[PDB]
Design a protein around this ligand. Structure first.
Ligand code: ZDC
Ligand code: CA
Ligand code: CA
Length: 114
């Protein structure tokens, strides 16, 4: 199934933050309505934050996370969780290799802000 694609409410600010846990430099691209809105890159095996940013979901609300390592797309896992009918999380893990820890880039999107 498709992973890493989330429909947000339109015209709403949201946060996106990426963490790395791999020997490989992770590149995380965040598309809003199919156009690049942020791109983060970095290397850590210690959960370093490789980027954090506030972005607007725009007219479509469509947000897609892509993760690439060594020029190759990583395998993605994702889900969304909503607490008290108000606080939203879109969660992505990714695997760049064969150990299947799925933490090589971890991406957390949260809304609403403010
Ligand atoms: C080896 O390069 C694989 C790669 O880096 C490891 C240190 C570990 O984080 C593994 O999950 C990652 O796929
Ligand atoms: Ca891995
Ligand atoms: Ca890892």
């Amino acid at each position: 199934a498709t992973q890493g694609v989330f429909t947000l409410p339109a015209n709403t600010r949201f946060g996106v933050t990426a963490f790395a846990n791999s020997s490989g430099t992770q590149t995380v691209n965040v598309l809003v309505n199919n156009e690049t809105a942020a791109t983060f890159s970095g290397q850590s095996t210690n959960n370093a934050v490789i980027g954090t940013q506030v972005l607007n979901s725009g007219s479509s609300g469509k947000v897609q996370v892509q993760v690439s390592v060594n020029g190759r797309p990583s395998d993605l896992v994702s889900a969304q969780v909503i607490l008290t009918n108000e606080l939203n999380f879109a969660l992505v893990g990714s695997e760049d290799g064969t150990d299947n820890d799925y933490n090589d880039a971890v991406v957390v999107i949260n809304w609403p802000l403010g």
